[PDB]
mmCIF file of C-alpha atoms and ligand atoms in Angstrom:
data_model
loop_
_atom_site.group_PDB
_atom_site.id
_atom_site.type_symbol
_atom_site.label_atom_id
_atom_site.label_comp_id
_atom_site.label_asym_id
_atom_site.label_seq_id
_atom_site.Cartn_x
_atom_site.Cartn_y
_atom_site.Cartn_z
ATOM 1 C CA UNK A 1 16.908 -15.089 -2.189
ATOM 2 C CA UNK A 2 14.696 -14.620 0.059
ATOM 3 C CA UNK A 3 14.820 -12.358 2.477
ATOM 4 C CA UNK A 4 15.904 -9.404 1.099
ATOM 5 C CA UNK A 5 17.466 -6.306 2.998
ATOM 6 C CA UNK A 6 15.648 -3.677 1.400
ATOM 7 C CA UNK A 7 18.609 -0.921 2.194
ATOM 8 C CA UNK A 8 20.927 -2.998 0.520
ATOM 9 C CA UNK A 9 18.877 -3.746 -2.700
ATOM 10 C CA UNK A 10 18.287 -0.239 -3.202
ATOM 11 C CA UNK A 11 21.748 1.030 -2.749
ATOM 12 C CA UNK A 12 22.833 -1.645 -5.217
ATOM 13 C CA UNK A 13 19.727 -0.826 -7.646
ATOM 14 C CA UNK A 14 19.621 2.583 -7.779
ATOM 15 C CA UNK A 15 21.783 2.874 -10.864
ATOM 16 C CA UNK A 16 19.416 1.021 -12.818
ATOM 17 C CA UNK A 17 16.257 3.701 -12.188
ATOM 18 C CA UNK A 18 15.908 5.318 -15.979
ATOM 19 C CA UNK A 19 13.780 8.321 -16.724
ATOM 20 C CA UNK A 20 11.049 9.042 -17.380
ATOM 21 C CA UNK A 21 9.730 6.924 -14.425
ATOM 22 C CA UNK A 22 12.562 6.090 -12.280
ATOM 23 C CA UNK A 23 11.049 2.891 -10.923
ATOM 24 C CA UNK A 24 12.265 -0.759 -10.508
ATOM 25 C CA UNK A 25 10.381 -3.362 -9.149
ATOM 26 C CA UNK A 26 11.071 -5.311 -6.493
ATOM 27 C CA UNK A 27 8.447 -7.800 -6.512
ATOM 28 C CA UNK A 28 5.280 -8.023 -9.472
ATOM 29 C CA UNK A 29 3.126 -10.888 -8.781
ATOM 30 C CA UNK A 30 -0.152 -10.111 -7.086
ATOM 31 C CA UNK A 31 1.539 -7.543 -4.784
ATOM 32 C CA UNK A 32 3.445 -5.237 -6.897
ATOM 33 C CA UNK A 33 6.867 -3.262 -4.544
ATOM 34 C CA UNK A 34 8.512 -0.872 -6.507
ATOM 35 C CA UNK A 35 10.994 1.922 -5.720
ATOM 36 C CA UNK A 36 11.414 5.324 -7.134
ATOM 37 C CA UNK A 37 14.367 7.560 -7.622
ATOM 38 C CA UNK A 38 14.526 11.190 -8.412
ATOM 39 C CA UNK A 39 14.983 14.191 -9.417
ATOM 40 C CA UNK A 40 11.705 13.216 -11.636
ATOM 41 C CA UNK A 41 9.025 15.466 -13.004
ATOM 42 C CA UNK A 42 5.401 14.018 -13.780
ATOM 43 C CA UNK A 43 3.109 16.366 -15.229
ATOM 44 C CA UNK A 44 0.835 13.316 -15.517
ATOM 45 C CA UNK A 45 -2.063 12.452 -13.240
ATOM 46 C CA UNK A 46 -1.973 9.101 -12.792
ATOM 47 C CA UNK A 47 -5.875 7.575 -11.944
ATOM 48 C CA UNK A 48 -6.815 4.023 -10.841
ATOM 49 C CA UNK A 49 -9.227 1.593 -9.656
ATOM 50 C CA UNK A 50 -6.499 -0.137 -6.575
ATOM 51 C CA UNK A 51 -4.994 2.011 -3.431
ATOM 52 C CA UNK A 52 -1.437 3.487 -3.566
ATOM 53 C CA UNK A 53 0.494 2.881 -0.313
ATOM 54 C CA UNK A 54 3.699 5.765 -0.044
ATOM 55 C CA UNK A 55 6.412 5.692 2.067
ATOM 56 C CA UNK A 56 9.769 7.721 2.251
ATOM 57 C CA UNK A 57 12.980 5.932 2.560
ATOM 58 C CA UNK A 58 15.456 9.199 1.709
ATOM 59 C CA UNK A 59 14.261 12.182 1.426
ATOM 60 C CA UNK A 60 10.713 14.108 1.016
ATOM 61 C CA UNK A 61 8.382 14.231 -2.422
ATOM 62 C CA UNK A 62 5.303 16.454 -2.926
ATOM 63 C CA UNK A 63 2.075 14.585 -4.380
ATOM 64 C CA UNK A 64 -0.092 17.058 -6.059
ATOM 65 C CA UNK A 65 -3.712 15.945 -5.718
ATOM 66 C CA UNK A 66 -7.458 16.274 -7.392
ATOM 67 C CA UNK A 67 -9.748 15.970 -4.355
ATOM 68 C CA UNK A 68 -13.341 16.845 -5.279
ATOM 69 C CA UNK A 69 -12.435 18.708 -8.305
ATOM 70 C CA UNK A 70 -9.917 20.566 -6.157
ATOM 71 C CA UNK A 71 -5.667 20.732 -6.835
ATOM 72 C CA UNK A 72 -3.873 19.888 -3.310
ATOM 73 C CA UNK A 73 -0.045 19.645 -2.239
ATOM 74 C CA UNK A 74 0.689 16.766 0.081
ATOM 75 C CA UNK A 75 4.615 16.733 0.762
ATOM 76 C CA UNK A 76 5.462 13.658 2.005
ATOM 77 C CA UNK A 77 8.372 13.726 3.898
ATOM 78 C CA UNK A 78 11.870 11.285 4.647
ATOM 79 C CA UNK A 79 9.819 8.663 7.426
ATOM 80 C CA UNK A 80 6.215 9.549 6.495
ATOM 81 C CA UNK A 81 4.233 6.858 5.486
ATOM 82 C CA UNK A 82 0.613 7.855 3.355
ATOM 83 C CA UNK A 83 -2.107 5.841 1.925
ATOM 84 C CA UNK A 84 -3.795 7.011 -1.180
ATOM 85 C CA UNK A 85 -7.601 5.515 -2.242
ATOM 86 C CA UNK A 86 -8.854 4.426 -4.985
ATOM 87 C CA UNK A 87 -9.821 6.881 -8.134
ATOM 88 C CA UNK A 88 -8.175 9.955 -6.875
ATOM 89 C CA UNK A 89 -6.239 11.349 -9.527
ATOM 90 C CA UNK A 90 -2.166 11.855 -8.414
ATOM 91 C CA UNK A 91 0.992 13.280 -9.547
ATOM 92 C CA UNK A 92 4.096 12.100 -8.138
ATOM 93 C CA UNK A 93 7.200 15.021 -8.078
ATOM 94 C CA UNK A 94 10.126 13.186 -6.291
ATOM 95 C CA UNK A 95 13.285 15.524 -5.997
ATOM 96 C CA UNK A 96 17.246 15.094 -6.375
ATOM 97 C CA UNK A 97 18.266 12.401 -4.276
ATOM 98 C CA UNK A 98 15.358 10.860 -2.997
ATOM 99 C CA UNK A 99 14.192 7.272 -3.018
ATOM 100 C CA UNK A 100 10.571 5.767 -2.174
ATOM 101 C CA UNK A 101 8.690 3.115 -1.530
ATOM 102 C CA UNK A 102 5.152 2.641 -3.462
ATOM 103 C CA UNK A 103 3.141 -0.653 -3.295
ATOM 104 C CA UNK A 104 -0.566 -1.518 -5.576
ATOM 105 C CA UNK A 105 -1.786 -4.527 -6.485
ATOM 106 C CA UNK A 106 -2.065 -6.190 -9.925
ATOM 107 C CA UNK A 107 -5.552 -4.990 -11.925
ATOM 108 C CA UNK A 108 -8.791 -6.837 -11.686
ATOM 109 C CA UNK A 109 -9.588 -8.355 -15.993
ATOM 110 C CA UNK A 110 -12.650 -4.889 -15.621
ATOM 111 C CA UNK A 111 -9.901 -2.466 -14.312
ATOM 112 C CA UNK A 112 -8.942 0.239 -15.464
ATOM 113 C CA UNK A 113 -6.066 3.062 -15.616
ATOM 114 C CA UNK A 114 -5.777 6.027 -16.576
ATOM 115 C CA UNK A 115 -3.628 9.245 -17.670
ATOM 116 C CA UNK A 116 -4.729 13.010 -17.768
ATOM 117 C CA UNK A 117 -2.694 16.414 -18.443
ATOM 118 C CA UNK A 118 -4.674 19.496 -17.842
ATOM 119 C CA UNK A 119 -4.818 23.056 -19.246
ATOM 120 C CA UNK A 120 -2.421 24.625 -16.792
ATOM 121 C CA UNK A 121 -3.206 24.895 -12.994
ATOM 122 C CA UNK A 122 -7.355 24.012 -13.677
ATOM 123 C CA UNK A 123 -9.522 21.019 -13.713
ATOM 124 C CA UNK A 124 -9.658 21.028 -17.457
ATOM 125 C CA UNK A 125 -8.124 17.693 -19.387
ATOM 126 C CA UNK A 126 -5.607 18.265 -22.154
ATOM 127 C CA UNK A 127 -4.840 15.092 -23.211
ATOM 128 C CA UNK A 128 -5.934 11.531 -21.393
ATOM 129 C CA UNK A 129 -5.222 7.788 -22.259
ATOM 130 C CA UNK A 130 -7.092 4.802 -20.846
ATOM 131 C CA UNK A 131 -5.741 1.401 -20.932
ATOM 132 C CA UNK A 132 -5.386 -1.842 -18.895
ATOM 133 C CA UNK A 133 -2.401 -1.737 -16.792
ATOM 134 C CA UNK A 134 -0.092 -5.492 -16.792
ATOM 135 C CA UNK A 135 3.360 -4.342 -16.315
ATOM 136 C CA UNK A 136 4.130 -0.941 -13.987
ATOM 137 C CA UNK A 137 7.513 -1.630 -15.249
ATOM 138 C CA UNK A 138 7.184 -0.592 -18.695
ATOM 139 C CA UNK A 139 3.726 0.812 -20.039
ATOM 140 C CA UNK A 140 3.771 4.599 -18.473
ATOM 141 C CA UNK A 141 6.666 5.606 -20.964
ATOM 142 C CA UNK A 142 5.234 4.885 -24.206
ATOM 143 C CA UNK A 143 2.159 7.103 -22.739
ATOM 144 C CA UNK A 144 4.112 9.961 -21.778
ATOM 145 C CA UNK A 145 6.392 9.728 -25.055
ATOM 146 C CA UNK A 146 3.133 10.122 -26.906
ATOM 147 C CA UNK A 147 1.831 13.384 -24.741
ATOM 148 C CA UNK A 148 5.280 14.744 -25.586
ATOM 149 C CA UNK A 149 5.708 14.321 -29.094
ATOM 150 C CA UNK A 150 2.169 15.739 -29.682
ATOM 151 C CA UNK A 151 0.173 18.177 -30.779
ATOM 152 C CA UNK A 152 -1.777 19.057 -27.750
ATOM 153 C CA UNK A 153 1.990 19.569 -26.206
ATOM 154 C CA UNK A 154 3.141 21.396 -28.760
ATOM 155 C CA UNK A 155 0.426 23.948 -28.522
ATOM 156 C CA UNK A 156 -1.685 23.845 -25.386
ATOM 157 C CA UNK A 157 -5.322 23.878 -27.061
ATOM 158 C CA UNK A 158 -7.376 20.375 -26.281
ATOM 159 C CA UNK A 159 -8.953 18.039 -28.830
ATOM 160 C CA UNK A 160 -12.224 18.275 -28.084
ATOM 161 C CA UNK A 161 -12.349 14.936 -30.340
ATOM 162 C CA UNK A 162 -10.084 12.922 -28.440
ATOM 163 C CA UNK A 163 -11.858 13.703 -25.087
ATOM 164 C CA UNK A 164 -13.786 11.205 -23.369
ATOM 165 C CA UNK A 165 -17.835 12.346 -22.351
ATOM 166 C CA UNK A 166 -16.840 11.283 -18.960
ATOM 167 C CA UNK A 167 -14.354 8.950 -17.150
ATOM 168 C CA UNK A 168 -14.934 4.819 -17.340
ATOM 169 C CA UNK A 169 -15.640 5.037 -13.653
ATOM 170 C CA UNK A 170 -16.513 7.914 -11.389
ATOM 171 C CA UNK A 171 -13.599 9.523 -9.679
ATOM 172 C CA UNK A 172 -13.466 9.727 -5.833
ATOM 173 C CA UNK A 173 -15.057 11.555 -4.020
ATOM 174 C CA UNK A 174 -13.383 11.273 -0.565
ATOM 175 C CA UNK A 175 -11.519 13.544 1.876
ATOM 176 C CA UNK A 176 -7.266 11.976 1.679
ATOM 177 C CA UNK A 177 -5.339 11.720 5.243
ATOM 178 C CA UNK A 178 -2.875 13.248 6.458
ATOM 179 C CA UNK A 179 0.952 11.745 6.056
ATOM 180 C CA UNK A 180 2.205 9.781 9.513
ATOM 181 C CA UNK A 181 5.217 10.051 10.949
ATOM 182 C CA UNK A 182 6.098 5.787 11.136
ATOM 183 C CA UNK A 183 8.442 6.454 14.085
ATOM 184 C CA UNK A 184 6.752 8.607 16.106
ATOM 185 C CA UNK A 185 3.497 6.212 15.718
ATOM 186 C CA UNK A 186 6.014 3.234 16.910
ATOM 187 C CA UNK A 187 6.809 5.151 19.718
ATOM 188 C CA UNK A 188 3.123 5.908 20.546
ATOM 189 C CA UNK A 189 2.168 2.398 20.631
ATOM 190 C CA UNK A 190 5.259 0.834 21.946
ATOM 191 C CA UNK A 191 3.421 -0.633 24.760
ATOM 192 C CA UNK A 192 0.346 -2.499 22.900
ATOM 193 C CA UNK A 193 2.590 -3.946 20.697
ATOM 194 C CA UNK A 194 5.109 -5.415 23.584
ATOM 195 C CA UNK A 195 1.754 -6.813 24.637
ATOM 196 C CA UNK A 196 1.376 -8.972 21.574
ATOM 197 C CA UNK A 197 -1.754 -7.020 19.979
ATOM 198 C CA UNK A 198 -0.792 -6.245 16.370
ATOM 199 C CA UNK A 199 -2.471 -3.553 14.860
ATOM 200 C CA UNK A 200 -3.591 -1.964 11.872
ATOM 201 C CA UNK A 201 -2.135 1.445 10.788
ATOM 202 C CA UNK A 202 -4.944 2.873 8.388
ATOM 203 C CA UNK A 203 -8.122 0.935 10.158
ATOM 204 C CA UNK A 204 -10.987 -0.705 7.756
ATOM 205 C CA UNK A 205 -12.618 1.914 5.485
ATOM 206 C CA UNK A 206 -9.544 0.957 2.749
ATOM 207 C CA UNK A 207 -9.093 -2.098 1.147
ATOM 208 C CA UNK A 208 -5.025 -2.315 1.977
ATOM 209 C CA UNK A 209 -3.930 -3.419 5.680
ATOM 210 C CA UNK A 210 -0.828 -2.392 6.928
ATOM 211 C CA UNK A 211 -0.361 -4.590 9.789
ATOM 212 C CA UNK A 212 1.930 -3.777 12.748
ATOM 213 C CA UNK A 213 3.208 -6.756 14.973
ATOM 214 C CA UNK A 214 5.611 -7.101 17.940
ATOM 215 C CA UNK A 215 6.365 -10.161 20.012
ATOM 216 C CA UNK A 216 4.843 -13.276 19.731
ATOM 217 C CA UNK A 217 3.935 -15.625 17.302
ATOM 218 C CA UNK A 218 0.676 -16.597 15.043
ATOM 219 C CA UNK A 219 -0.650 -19.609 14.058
ATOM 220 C CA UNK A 220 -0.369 -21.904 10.255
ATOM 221 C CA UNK A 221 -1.882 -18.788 8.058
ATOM 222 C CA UNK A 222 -2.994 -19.065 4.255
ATOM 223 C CA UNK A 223 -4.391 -16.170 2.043
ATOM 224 C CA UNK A 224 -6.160 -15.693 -1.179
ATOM 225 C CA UNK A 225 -3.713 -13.001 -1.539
ATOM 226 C CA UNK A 226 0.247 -12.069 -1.985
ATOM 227 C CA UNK A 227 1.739 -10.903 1.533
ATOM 228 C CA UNK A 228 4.320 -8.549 2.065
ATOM 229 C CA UNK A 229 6.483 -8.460 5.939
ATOM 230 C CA UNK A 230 9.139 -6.212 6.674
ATOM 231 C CA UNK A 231 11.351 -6.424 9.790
ATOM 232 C CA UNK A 232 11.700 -2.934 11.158
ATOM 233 C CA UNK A 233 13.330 -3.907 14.740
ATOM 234 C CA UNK A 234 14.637 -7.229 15.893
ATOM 235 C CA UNK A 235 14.187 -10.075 14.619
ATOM 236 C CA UNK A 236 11.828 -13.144 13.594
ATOM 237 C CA UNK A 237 10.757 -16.614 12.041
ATOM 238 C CA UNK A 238 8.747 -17.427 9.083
ATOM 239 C CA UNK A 239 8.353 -20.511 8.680
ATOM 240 C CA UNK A 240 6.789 -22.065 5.167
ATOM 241 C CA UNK A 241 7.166 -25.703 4.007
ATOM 242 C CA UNK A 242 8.963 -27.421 6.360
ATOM 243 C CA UNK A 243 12.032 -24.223 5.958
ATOM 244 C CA UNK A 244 12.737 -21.403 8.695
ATOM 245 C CA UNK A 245 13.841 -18.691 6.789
ATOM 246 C CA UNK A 246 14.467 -15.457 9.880
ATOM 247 C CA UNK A 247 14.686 -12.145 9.447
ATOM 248 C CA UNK A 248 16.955 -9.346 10.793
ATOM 249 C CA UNK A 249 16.699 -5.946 10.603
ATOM 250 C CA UNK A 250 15.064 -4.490 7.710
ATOM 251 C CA UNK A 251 14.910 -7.803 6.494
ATOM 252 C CA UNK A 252 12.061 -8.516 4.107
ATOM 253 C CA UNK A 253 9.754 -11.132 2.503
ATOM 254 C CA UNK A 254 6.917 -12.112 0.126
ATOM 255 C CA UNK A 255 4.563 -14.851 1.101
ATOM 256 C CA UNK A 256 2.816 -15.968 -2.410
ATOM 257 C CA UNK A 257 -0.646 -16.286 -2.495
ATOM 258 C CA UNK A 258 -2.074 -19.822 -1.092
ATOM 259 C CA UNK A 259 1.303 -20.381 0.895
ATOM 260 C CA UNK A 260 1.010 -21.509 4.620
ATOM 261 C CA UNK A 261 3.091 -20.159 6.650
ATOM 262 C CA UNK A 262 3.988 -19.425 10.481
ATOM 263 C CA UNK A 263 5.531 -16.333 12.071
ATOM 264 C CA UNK A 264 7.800 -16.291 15.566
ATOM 265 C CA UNK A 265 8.738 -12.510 16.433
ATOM 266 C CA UNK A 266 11.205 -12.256 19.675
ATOM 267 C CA UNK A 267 11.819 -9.849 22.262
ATOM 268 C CA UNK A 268 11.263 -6.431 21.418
ATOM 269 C CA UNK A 269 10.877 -6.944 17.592
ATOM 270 C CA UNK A 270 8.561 -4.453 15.530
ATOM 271 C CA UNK A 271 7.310 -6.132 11.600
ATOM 272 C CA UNK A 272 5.050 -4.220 9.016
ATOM 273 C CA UNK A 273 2.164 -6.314 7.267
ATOM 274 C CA UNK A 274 1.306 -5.532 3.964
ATOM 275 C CA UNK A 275 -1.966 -6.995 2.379
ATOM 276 C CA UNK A 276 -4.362 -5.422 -0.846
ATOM 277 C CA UNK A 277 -7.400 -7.763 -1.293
ATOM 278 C CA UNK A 278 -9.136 -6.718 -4.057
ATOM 279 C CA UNK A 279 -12.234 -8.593 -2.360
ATOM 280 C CA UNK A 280 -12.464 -5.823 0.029
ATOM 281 C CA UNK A 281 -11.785 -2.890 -2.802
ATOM 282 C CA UNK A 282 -14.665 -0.116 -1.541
ATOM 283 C CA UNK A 283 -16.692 0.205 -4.416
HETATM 284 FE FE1 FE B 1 -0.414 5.889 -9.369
#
């Protein structure tokens, strides 16, 4: 339209999220931005080869973890903001009345995704799929549909058969953070970013940057990659193609890929920076 206020497009989408994923997308080019409703049970693990960036909008969710071989609870909570890396396998439970924000990138032509169900609370698979992942709108269902109108559901015992030797790719073997408080960071770097310094909220051992910039401006700006701002206090100027389109609070926009494009951010104002270059995945 563009901007959009993100508040309002989710309070007018929100009766369009339809089990069994409960996800509509706001944007799907290179940069996919999707939001999630609840109550909504995944007993799937979910594995794959890009980073997963959470945050809360309304309400908290629990992500149940493999991390070395080990099952972990991370509750994410209303404000928290969490980055996940790449091959750690994930499970999503979002409760009643809850809505979140989840951005990935579109999959590289050799990338690959994944599904698992294990044998009850242990490490060992049930049932997996493996498949190229184009749409996040629409290709989970017919996967879970399948686990549920099977036989491996229906009893519990795996098919050794229909077991893969090992996975495509080797799963992760790092440590996962700890979920941030967004607000409380603001608050603890209020005064380097009314000094015009943005900064990066994760640092450079991921491939994502989440960008955090105050006043000031920046200079005629073209990347490889899809870009993703998001006004979280006062206001701004992008300006691409001879058009100034500004931005409000929680105002947001998509710079396409090979785009050029200036920024202005006045007094006071506070924008997030989303990037995932698949040129610095860390593999
Ligand atoms: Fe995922």
């Amino acid at each position: 339209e563009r901007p959009v206020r993100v508040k309002a497009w989710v309070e007018e989408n929100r009766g369009s999220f339809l089990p069994p994923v409960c996800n509509k997308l706001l944007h799907q080019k290179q940069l996919k931005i999707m939001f999630v409703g609840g109550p909504n049970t995944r007993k799937d693990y979910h594995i794959e080869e890009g980073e997963e960036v959470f945050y809360q909008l309304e309400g908290d969710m629990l992500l149940r973890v493999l991390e070395r071989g080990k099952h972990r609870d991370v509750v994410i909570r209303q404000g928290e903001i969490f980055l996940l890396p790449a091959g750690v396998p994930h499970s999503p439970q979002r409760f009643a009345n809850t809505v979140g924000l989840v951005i990935e990138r579109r999959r590289l032509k050799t990338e690959l995704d994944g599904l698992r169900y294990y044998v009850g609370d242990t490490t060992d698979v049930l049932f997996e799929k493996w498949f190229y992942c184009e749409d996040l709108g629409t290709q989970l269902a017919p996967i879970i549909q399948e686990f549920f109108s099977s036989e491996q559901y229906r009893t519990g015992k795996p098919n050794p058969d229909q077991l893969l030797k090992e996975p495509p790719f080797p799963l992760s073997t790092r440590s996962v953070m700890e979920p941030m408080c967004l607000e409380a960071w603001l608050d603890g770097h209020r005064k380097e970013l009314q000094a015009g310094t943005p900064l990066s909220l994760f640092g450079d051992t991921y491939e994502s940057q989440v960008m955090v910039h105050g006043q000031g401006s920046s200079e005629g700006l073209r990347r490889d990659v899809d870009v993703w701002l998001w006004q979280l206090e006062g206001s701004s100027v992008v300006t691409m193609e001879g058009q100034r389109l500004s931005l409000t609070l929680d105002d947001s926009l998509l710079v396409p890929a090979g785009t050029l494009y200036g920024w202005e951010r006045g007094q006071g104002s506070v924008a997030l920076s989303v990037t995932q270059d698949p040129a610095c995945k860390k593999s």
